[PDB]
Every structure is written in structure tokens, then in C-alpha cells.
Design a protein around this ligand. Structure first.
Ligand code: FES
Ligand code: K
Ligand code: K
Ligand code: K
Ligand code: MG
Ligand code: MG
Ligand code: MG
Ligand code: MG
Ligand code: MG
Ligand code: MG
Ligand code: MG
Ligand code: MG
Ligand code: MG
Ligand code: MG
Ligand code: MG
Ligand code: MG
Ligand code: MG
Ligand code: MG
Ligand code: MG
Ligand code: MG
Ligand code: MG
Lengths: 48, 97, 72, 58, 137, 128, 74, 86, 122, 23
RNA sequence: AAACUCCAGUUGACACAAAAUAGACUACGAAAGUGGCUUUAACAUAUCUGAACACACAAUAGCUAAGACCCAAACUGGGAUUAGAUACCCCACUAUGCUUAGCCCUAAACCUCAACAGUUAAAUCAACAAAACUGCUCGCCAGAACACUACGAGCCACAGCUUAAAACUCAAAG
């Protein structure tokens, strides 16, 4: 199962052919790793 | 013989084990908003487990993540980033009383 | 006792009954004890599923006029 | 919650090195310490200063 | 609005003003409270010296500098010179745990200055230079 | 040492791995793994060559092979780190534990003992 | 002390004796000096509570055994 | 030195009440351990002496936290004597 | 194995940032790395003023590069990043997702230690 | 325990090192 | 007091030094030791015991050679104190603490409690300390002082370390 999953992920890996296209896409996108925890143990994702 | 004699069981009324607020949640050094919740707003000092309320395993993870983020240019050291001062308070400490 | 498994489950689902325990009366039966009794009576019928048997027990009490307000 | 005492002292069962070295047995006494008098401090230093300052002026 | 003990962030927009000046423009009073002396320097928000006064410049000598009254006199002296240059509101930044840590601010207030905030900047090395050895007293 | 293209011990026997993409193959190869993964394949090769039953890992023979692989790793580490006293102790201790294993094997099974010495290139020396 | 009054009445009613108060040292092992040379000691001692007010055995339990007096105790 | 100034250990004065502000600031430094830390840093504390003090302060926390737990447990029994005269 | 490059870049315009990102990714590929993904965390004010290559930086663009490289490549890449003047701070860590969290049952209570001292009467 | 045994050994060793230095 | 005034405060630039908080955690390592961040290598043994010397290690101080300079600091100098002060207090500055390459091989190196296996029963048990014991094995000890000494031998040690007595003396030492 792990080899099968890996064979699917490699399709999206960055290569020299798509490097420039992937760099531009990254500049446009934004990824957020920030989130808060409440006293009840609930995740409060950021609202932005 | 007699059927009313006590039988051998595990405590059925036993309550489930308590869990820390971060139990089962990945702690990342990039998650500066979460890490800032466990540092002093005035001095940036990391809070002890008696204040944070975290388990021993999560207290270590938070400490190691704070130290890593602070030296990699993600988190300030001498104070808590003002942007995160309005996040939920999860630490048992009162500075004004 | 065998019925402690039932009592533990009942207290978790419904909580302490509204009727206050009168420990002075030796024959006092509480809402939980009534549940255990009905649960046992339905066990004699031949029900082998605790969850199904637990559901059937609550339904019989509701029909008898007992107030069973779940914690939810 | 009180800090743990399990494995903290040097005992035969304890394999690791002692964490604590209490000079008296960790056993609650039947008494508490007596109330300590507050340390005396000079009072009315500010009010003295303003009076003494004006004397210099006048 | 509820009073916020936290200082206004320079980047964000705040409504708090002192004589039409924002928190980032109020002059700063640097107090160095040492065990044997207290030094007070009032500087503008752009680091322009305005006034300086220490327990030594007020005529106190030797152990008489390390007293609350000596620091209070130094505070009043700095406040007098600072008020001549147009200073009213000051942001106090104290450094050290000397005897004149608090008395210096009392002198500044007694001299006609208004303290809007108190910042502690006592240097604490995070691990640093090894201090002198302990004394045998 | 095993070639860097060698597939990991865990993924070597999964069906259809010979036809996966080249990127997947090198991601599952020894090149993209730590030093310990290569040591496992080394142990496997020695077990198949010398031991009658490679599946049995509790035999006195498999333990000698596994220990010799560890001994070789310490020698490679100590070649780079000459003042590492912690690992110099581990190597000398490992060498003495293999001698004890070899002495017990020599006393019990000589025919098998001789095969261990030949395959692993170990010369049995008697103590002074 | 919750039952001191009850026990003192029960003893007086059955024509016997009760000691529900602070037990002074030597009541049994030093009786001839405390009461008199011809004093007669109890033949039976019934402990309705065998512990004193610091949750330790009532001293008379040991002293009754010293004086070879049988004891009944809850 | 590198961080932004006027954010750390800064307290705002409410209605010109400097006394209450200094008490608050001093309480923040004490609760975090900065006041006690600064005093111990005046002279070098040798490792053996630091370990001896930490052992002392840790044994004292355990005792004080256990005595306080017993005081709060027995405070219920500070009631008036119910069987006065028995 | 799988790594994560926490790359804080200098505050530049989009064309220069694209050139730097491509240059950094190409250096990883030159060392045998299989780059998996590129994430843009956005440009933010640095937590503290960082002085790099005789320049004082107060802002920077935070990026993440997920890649698989051989153990020997890590040291080489760290050297390359040090020489790049467009990189404020560059750090390579073992990818956090590779590390699996062990299932936690909860906090188990520890009872007060007993029999520390003999029961002799002192 | 007192340090009377250590004290005797302390003086012996001090006097010994002083003798060796002198001679 | 001496010292400093080529000083002090604010701001900016700025280590081959040392690693607040977390840590009320009690983990890692054979011990010595180990508490800033990252990465690589990596933490012997499927019965146990087994060495002053064999094999490999071993805080601090110290030695040899080449570097580094913030701070600390034996020695030394100055100031003060004192009957004196070769100290305690103040100031200044060295060796040294750091790095590299070799030595030296000591500690209250003590948690003064040996390794492995097992027990909580009875008289538990001189005292104190950290309750009392069983099996098995190696190491060590037989009054105090002489003596961490003399001599002999070994050692990169040469004012050293390890091993280690005797004579005279006492009726105690502990
Ligand atoms: S209790 Fe589950 S991780 Fe803390
Ligand atoms: K540190
Ligand atoms: K020794
Ligand atoms: K010791
Ligand atoms: Mg003691
Ligand atoms: Mg003593
Ligand atoms: Mg002598
Ligand atoms: Mg002078
Ligand atoms: Mg600490
Ligand atoms: Mg052995
Ligand atoms: Mg021997
Ligand atoms: Mg050494
Ligand atoms: Mg040296
Ligand atoms: Mg100096
Ligand atoms: Mg020097
Ligand atoms: Mg260093
Ligand atoms: Mg030690
Ligand atoms: Mg042994
Ligand atoms: Mg010696
Ligand atoms: Mg000798
Ligand atoms: Mg000789």
C-alpha cells in the first residue's frame, strides 16, 4: 500500500521541466501553519 | 452454593484517563501562534507544566519547538509577539492579581 | 457485582436520577435499581446484545411513566 | 499538585542517582513556623526631604 | 474602552494620545539604578539628549549616593532640566535593582513630569560572561 | 558495501516494485536511506551465505554474524572519529563478545564454526 | 465525645461503671496509690471505642492487659 | 539588542497611578523569576553550590505544598466544639 | 531521507524571488535531491533584526522546500546556502511528518511515594 | 561524623609536601 | 581609600567566550559526565560472576607545543583593616579556564551502601542513618599511631603516581 501511495505522490513532485511553473504557483499561493488551542482542546484555525 | 457473593471484575465505574489539551495534536515549530500561547507575554519565558497544564510529553515537545522556532527566525525571544496577545488563554497564571 | 456494569452505564447515559436516594429506608428502590431490575428481566427473555438490551430497558421504563432525561 | 518523591531520594530500590538530598526527613511536623515580625523601615523620608529642601532655600 | 496594560504597538493604529503625540514620540527617561549610584538621562523619541542627572552630580558622595533620597534628588534635578526643554510626558526605562530604582521615578514625578509607562530593561544574560566570585563575609 | 541502487530490505520483496517509476525506485533504494538500512542488507547477505536457516535469528551463528556487522560499522565510524572514546569502548566490547560466541560455537559445533570463520573472515585466536 | 453522655447513662442504668473522660496515667497500674490500698479494680472492661482522640489505641487497652483484666472491645 | 523596544517588560500607567504600575511590573518580574535570577547572578554561583541550592529549594517546595494541603484539609474542623462539656 | 528547508529569503520583488527560489531548488537537485513541494508562507516582519552578509534585514519571505536527499547532501547544501547572499537564514531539518506520534492514552496519576522512611518512633 | 581522622592525614600530607619541597 | 576621568549614559555596528526561562521534568551514559540550535555517524552481549597491574576509559588542577582575548582569576602590585594581616574587604593584571595535538591518571571519583537472583515471613531491629533479610560470586578488612611514609619495582610521570612495610611508643584509638 505504501509503494502504491508513493507512486501517486511522485506524479506531483517538482522536476526540472516544471520547476519554473511550480515556482510561480508557489509565489501566488499562501500556506498557513498557525492555529490556536482552547482550554477545551479544540483547534481554532485562523480566520483570514 | 450462593449466587450473591461478590464476583471479580475490573472497576466498571472507573473514569477515563485525563488528557492534556494538546493530546493527539501535532506540535510544529512553524506553528508560532500555538507556541506563543505557552510563553510569558512580558518576558517571553516558557511556562512550566504547572502553569501550562501540559503533560510531560507535550511539555517537552512545546519546549523543543519554541527553542527551534526562536533560533530559525520564526519566533521572538525576549517577548511574546503582540499579534498573538488576543488568542485564547490556556495557562493558569494571573499577573494583575 | 454483575449489575455494576449496568449501573455504570446507566449513570453515564442518564446521570443521577432526580429522585433523591433515601438510604434510611432499607427497601428503597432508585431509578437506577429499577433499570437494573428491568434489564435483568429482559435478560431472562434471552436478549444477548447489551446495547439492544439497554435500549429495550429504557423503552420499558418510559412506557411505565418514568422520567429518563438523558445528559444530552 | 505536589512534585513527585518517587525515585528522588537515594534508596536501595532506586537505581538512579538521587535527585534530592534533604538535610531533614521529608515528614510533616505537628507545628508551623511562628509569625515573623515585619522588618522596620524608615518612614516619612519623602516628607522630611521636602521640608529639609525648603530650609536650604529659605 | 477597557484599560490595556500592554503598550500600543508602533505599527498598528491606536487612539491613545498624550498632548497630541503618539506613544512612539514620547521622550524616554533612562534610569540606571546601580547599587552605589543612580543615573537618569532624558532623551527624545529620536535619541537626542535633553537632560542628565545622577546622585553624584547632586553633591552626594560615596555611600550617600546609594540611597533613596539621593536618587529622588537626582530625579527632581533631571525633571527640572527636562521640563525647561518642553518635556511633560515621559516613558520610563529603568535598568538595575539599586536602591534608587523607585525613588528616581518619584523624583521625576515630583519635578512635574508625567510617567505614562514603565519599562524594565535590566540586563539578564542567557547563559554570558562569568561574574566575579562570591564574597567571604 | 551493497550497491547504492539496492532496494531496501522491507521493499525488496513487495510485488511489482520492479516496474515502478525510476524516481520511486531510487526513493526506495539505499541511496536515500541512512547507514543502518545498508547494514540490514549486509546482515541478510551473510545470513544466506553462511547460515543453513536464514529465518532463524536466535541461533548462535546468526548472533555472531549480526555482531560482526555491528563491529564493522564501529570500525568505519572510528576511522572518521578517532577521539570518540564511547565508540572505541563499544568496538572493543563487541570484539570480546564475538570471541565468547566463537568459543562457545567451537566447543559445540565445529563444522558450523569453521563455516563462520571462513565466511566472515574471522581468525580464531586463543587467549594468552 | 459524641457518645460520652449516652455511655455514662447506660452504665448508671445497669448498675455498672463508666469512664468516658480523659484517662489519667496510672488509673489501673497505679490504682492503690491513686484510690487507696483496699481499692478493688474492675473485673471486666468493655471498650465501646478502642481508639483515643488521636486515632491511637486507648492506653487502658495496654494497662488492662498489664493488670490481667479481660477486655471486650468494638 | 536586536528585538523591538518597548514591548518587553513594559507596563502602562492607568490614570497616572505610577505606584500601582510599579507594583504590577515588580510582580510580573517576580512571578517569572527575573528578580530572583538577577540577584543570584551578581556573584558567580559555583555548580556544586547551585545544585545544593536547587535541592534545598525543591525539598522546601514539596514540604510547603504538603503542609498547605493539610492546613486546607483540616480547616473544615476549625468549627466550634459541638460536644462542649463531654 | 526526507528533509525540510526553512528558507527565509530577502525582501525582494517577485522576479528576483523567483530567480532565488529556482536557484536554490536547482542546487538541491544538483546534489541528488528529489524536490517534492514548494510552499510560500508569506512575507512577514522578522522576529528580530537579522544581520546577514553585511546587511541588516527587518523583513523576509518565508518559504519551505520538501525534498528527499541522501544524507551526504545535507552538509553540502548547508554550505551552498551560506554563500548565497539572497538568503537571510537557511536551515535543514528532518521533515516533521516522518516522525509518527505514539498513541497517548492520557495522564496516569502517580500516587504519593510511600515507605521513604522507616516506621520507627522518633 | 567529625573530621578528626581527616585532619591528622591533612597535617601529615601538608608537612610531607613541605619537606619534599625543602629537600 | 586607591583606581578611572582615552570616563559615564543613550543609539548603532559587533566573538575561537558562556549557554536565563522550560526544569515543580528525573531522562541519557560504564563511570567520569551530559540541559542553546541543526544535520551526519551512533549508544556491546539471548545465563550470571570475573583484574591496583592485562585491555580501554576516567571531573578539576597540572605539564609540552601552537593559537584565541569577553569575562573570571592562583600568583604579584596597590588601597584599606590589624598589635601584626604573607588573610578575610576594594582595585588592577598574569598563569589558568577555551581551541588543536600529545601527556599526566588523581578526587569527600561518596548515592562512603559491590555484581546477579530472590523475599517481606519472624526475634524486624545494639545506636544513628536510607527497614530487615536469603542464595551466589569476586574484591577487600582484622587495636591506635608510625603511614596517602621509608625501601624495592613499574610508569611519556623526575617536587609525581600506583603498590606498600618495619623499629621505637601507647592502653587506648574509634
Ligand atoms: S495527555 Fe496525551 S499527549 Fe498529553
Ligand atoms: K541557553
Ligand atoms: K580512591
Ligand atoms: K558523598
Ligand atoms: Mg546531614
Ligand atoms: Mg555536624
Ligand atoms: Mg602527624
Ligand atoms: Mg580618591
Ligand atoms: Mg532552571
Ligand atoms: Mg562481565
Ligand atoms: Mg587482584
Ligand atoms: Mg583527566
Ligand atoms: Mg588544560
Ligand atoms: Mg578582569
Ligand atoms: Mg589571561
Ligand atoms: Mg566554547
Ligand atoms: Mg561525583
Ligand atoms: Mg563486581
Ligand atoms: Mg593522594
Ligand atoms: Mg608515596
Ligand atoms: Mg621510591
Amino acid at each position: 500500500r505504501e509503494v502504491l501511495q508513493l507512486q501517486e505522490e511522485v506524479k506531483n513532485f517538482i522536476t526540472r521541466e516544471n520547476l519554473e511553473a511550480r515556482v510561480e504557483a508557489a509565489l501566488d499561493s499562501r500556506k498557513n501553519y498557525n492555529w490556536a488551542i482552547t482550554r477545551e482542546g479544540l483547534v481554532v484555525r485562523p480566520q483570514r | 452454593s450462593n449466587e450473591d457473593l461478590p464476583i471479580s471484575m475490573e472497576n466498571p465505574y472507573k473514569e477515563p484517563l485525563k488528557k492534556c489539551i494538546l493530546c493527539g495534536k501535532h506540535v510544529d515549530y512553524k506553528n508560532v501562534q500555538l507556541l506563543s500561547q505557552f510563553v510569558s507575554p512580558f518576558t517571553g519565558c516558557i511556562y512550566g507544566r504547572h502553569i501550562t497544564g501540559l503533560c510531560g510529553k507535550k511539555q517537552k515537545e512545546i519546549t523543543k519547538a519554541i527553542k527551534r522556532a526562536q533560533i530559525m527566525g520564526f519566533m521572538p525571544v525576549t517577548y511574546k509577539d503582540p499579534a498573538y496577545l488576543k488568542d485564547p488563554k490556556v495557562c493558569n497564571i494571573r499577573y494583575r492579581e | 457485582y454483575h449489575e455494576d456494569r449496568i449501573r455504570a452505564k446507566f449513570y453515564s447515559v442518564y446521570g443521577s436520577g432526580q429522585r433523591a436516594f433515601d438510604l434510611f429506608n432499607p427497601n428503597f428502590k432508585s431509578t437506577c435499581q429499577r433499570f437494573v431490575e428491568k434489564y435483568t428481566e429482559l435478560q431472562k427473555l434471552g436478549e444477548t446484545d447489551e446495547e439492544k438490551l439497554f435500549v429495550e430497558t429504557g423503552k420499558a421504563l418510559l412506557a411505565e411513566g418514568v422520567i429518563l432525561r438523558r445528559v444530552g | 499538585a505536589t512534585p513527585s518523591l518517587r525515585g528522588r531520594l537515594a534508596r536501595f530500590g532506586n537505581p538512579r542517582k538521587p535527585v534530592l538530598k534533604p538535610n531533614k526527613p521529608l515528614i510533616l511536623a505537628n507545628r508551623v513556623g511562628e509569625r515573623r515580625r515585619e522588618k522596620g523601615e524608615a518612614t516619612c523620608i519623602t516628607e522630611m526631604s521636602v521640608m529639609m529642601a525648603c530650609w536650604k532655600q529659605n | 474602552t477597557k484599560f490595556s496594560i500592554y503598550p500600543p504597538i508602533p505599527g498598528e493604529e491606536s487612539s491613545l494620545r498624550w498632548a497630541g503625540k503618539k506613544f512612539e514620540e514620547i521622550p524616554i527617561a533612562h534610569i540606571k539604578a546601580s547599587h552605589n549610584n543612580t543615573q537618569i538621562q532624558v532623551v527624545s523619541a529620536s535619541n537626542e539628549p535633553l537632560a542628565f542627572a545622577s546622585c553624584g552630580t547632586e553633591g552626594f558622595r560615596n555611600a550617600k549616593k546609594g540611597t533613596g533620597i539621593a536618587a529622588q534628588t537626582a530625579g527632581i534635578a533631571a525633571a527640572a532640566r527636562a521640563k525647561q526643554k518642553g518635556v511633560i510626558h515621559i516613558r520610563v526605562v529603568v535598568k538595575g535593582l539599586g536602591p534608587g530604582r523607585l525613588s528616581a521615578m518619584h523624583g521625576l514625578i515630583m519635578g512635574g513630569l508625567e510617567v505614562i509607562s514603565i519599562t524594565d530593561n535590566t540586563p539578564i544574560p542567557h547563559x554570558g560572561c562569568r561574574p566575579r566570585k562570591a564574597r567571604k563575609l | 558495501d551493497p550497491p547504492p541502487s539496492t532496494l531496501l530490505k522491507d521493499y525488496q520483496n513487495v510485488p511489482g516494485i520492479e516496474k515502478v517509476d525510476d524516481v520511486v525506485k531510487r526513493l526506495l533504494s539505499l541511496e536515500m536511506a541512512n547507514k543502518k538500512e545498508m547494514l540490514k542488507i549486509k546482515q541478510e547477505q551473510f545470513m544466506k551465505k553462511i547460515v543453513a536457516n536464514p529465518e532463524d535469528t536466535r541461533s548462535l551463528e546468526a548472533r555472531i554474524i549480526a555482531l560482526s556487522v555491528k563491529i564493522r560499522s564501529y570500525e568505519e565510524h572510528l576511522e572518521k572519529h578517532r577521539k570518540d572514546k564511547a565508540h572505541k569502548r563499544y568496538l572493543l566490547m563487541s570484539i570480546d563478545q564475538r570471541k565468547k560466541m566463537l568459543k562457545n560455537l567451537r566447543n559445540t559445533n565445529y563444522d558450523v564454526f569453521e563455516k563462520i570463520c571462513w565466511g566472515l573472515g574471522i581468525e580464531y585466536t586463543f587467549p594468552p | 465525645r459524641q457518645f460520652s453522655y449516652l455511655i455514662e447513662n447506660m452504665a448508671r442504668d445497669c448498675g455498672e461503671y463508666a469512664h468516658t473522660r480523659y484517662f489519667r496515667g496510672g488509673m489501673l497500674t497505679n490504682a492503690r496509690l491513686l484510690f487507696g490500698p483496699t481499692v478493688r479494680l474492675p473485673d471486666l472492661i468493655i471498650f465501646l471505642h478502642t481508639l483515643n482522640n488521636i486515632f491511637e489505641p486507648h492506653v487502658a487497652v495496654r494497662d488492662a492487659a498489664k493488670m490481667n483484666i479481660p477486655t471486650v472491645g468494638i | 539588542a536586536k528585538h523591538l523596544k518597548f514591548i518587553a517588560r513594559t507596563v502602562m500607567v492607568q490614570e497616572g497611578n505610577v505606584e500601582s504600575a510599579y507594583r504590577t511590573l515588580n510582580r510580573i518580574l517576580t512571578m517569572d523569576g527575573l528578580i530572583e535570577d538577577i540577584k543570584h547572578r551578581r556573584y558567580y554561583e559555583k555548580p556544586c553550590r547551585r545544585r545544593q541550592r536547587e535541592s534545598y529549594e525543591r525539598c522546601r517546595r514539596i514540604y510547603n505544598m504538603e503542609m498547605a494541603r493539610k492546613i486546607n484539609f483540616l480547616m473544615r474542623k476549625n468549627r466550634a466544639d459541638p460536644w462542649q462539656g463531654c | 531521507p526526507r528533509y525540510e528547508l526553512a528558507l527565509i529569503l530577502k525582501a525582494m520583488q517577485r522576479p528576483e524571488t523567483a530567480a532565488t527560489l529556482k536557484r536554490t531548488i536547482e542546487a538541491l537537485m544538483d546534489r541528488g535531491a528529489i524536490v517534492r513541494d514548494l510552499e510560500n508562507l508569506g512575507e512577514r516582519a522578522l522576529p528580530y533584526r537579522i544581520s546577514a552578509h553585511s546587511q541588516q534585514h527587518n523583513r523576509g519571505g518565508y518559504f519551505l522546500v520538501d525534498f528527499y536527499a541522501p544524507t551526504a547532501a545535507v552538509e553540502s547544501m548547508v554550505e551552498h546556502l551560506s554563500r548565497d547572499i539572497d538568503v537571510i537564514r537557511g536551515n535543514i531539518v528532518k521533515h516533521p511528518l516522518t516522525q509518527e506520534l505514539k498513541e497517548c492514552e492520557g495522564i496516569v496519576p502517580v500516587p504519593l511515594a510511600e515507605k521513604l522512611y522507616s516506621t520507627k518512633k522518633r | 561524623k567529625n573530621v578528626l581522622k581527616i585532619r591528622r592525614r591533612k597535617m601529615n600530607h601538608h608537612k610531607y609536601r613541605k619537606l619534599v619541597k625543602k629537600t
